[PDB]
Amino acid sequence: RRELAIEFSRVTESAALAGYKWLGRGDKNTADGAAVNAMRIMLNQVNIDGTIVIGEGEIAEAPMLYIGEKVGTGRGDAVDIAVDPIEGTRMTAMGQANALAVLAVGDKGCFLNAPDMYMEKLIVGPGAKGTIDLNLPLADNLRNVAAALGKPLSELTVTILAKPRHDAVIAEMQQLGVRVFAIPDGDVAASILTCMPDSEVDVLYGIGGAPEGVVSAAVIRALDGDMNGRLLARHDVKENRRIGEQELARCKAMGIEAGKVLRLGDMARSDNVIFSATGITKGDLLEGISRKGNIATTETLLIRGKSRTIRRIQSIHYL
Numbered sequence: 001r002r003e004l005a006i007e008f009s010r011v012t013e014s015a016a017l018a019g020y021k022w023l024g025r026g027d028k029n030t031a032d033g034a035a036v037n038a039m040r041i042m043l044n045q046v047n048i049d050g051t052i053v054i055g056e057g058e059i060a061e062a063p064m065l066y067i068g069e070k071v072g073t074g075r076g077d078a079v080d081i082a083v084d085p086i087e088g089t090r091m092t093a094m095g096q097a098n099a100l101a102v103l104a105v106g107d108k109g110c111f112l113n114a115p116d117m118y119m120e121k122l123i124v125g126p127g128a129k130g131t132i133d134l135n136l137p138l139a140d141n142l143r144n145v146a147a148a149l150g151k152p153l154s155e156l157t158v159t160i161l162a163k164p165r166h167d168a169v170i171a172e173m174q175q176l177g178v179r180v181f182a183i184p185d186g187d188v189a190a191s192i193l194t195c196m197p198d199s200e201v202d203v204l205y206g207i208g209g210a211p212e213g214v215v216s217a218a219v220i221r222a223l224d225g226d227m228n229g230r231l232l233a234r235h236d237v238k239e240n241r242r243i244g245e246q247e248l249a250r251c252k253a254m255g256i257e258a259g260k261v262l263r264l265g266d267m268a269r270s271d272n273v274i275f276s277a278t279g280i281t282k283g284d285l286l287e288g289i290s291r292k293g294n295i296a297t298t299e300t301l302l303i304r305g306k307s308r309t310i311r312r313i314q315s316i317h318y319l
């Protein structure tokens, strides 16, 4: 499957390019719809027998890249697919930094199927692999990570979604003497920073999308870091109890129990993962698309769990 790595990077490049057309145009859903459409089109020309496992939603409210959709030419291997055609849709609509197009491809059955609900995440890179456990308190995890990283706590840097749900815990960490990078959106890209040496980020902690968590699980596994997650029902996080109760019903069926700590391998089950991400706007991880005349440029991160060549591909496209 390593011959397909380039094909997959083309899938994100094309989703990025299509989402870029809608940058700064104040329309979340048209930008997203364009990226989705372009990603599906590209994936349907790749020689895989793909099943969308993480995607735009159920068949009833997502016509494209719905959960269980078959993609690819059907030649090649049966593979699980996680798509996030635009991570940072609001940012794309507003012309802000950190928008990117995301894809992960793995072995059949490789990715946890969990509902579109919230997940508490704790993520670190290779130097702190094995030092984390979400059953312990945050403070304990943080000291353990700092100690394994070989730095004082006060030097430790934690990134976290800047959201109301997170005020209490951001205070607790600042009080504890930790540097807190609060980001507006995008915990998929931010989790990868834990494994990028020239990023000051050591740790991602906090509650974001469950499907995003499973994509971070896959790439974090590929990069040999570590992650724990914990599914949480809407009302435990924020008539939320209405949607929170179907999430728990969906959990029983799926069949997983919320509130239990997922280890790395509970979410990303093998090392055979190809991860691809292409920047739409510039961010901590990737350069944005530039476009002068009939010539556009993209930067793509391409990671394959079987190895460690981490690839950054700078493409010059003649449209």
Ligand SMILES: O=P(O)(O)OC[C@H]1O[C@](O)(COP(=O)(O)O)[C@@H](O)[C@@H]1O
Pocket (backbone or CB within 6 Å): 086, 087, 088, 089, 090, 091, 161, 163, 184, 185, 186, 187, 188, 207, 208, 209, 210, 212
């Ligand atoms: O905004 P919420 O509801 O707190 O969701 C958090 C999730 O949204 C994201 O920030 C993506 O944002 P977008 O929905 O604008 O694409 C993810 O990175 C994160 O997991």
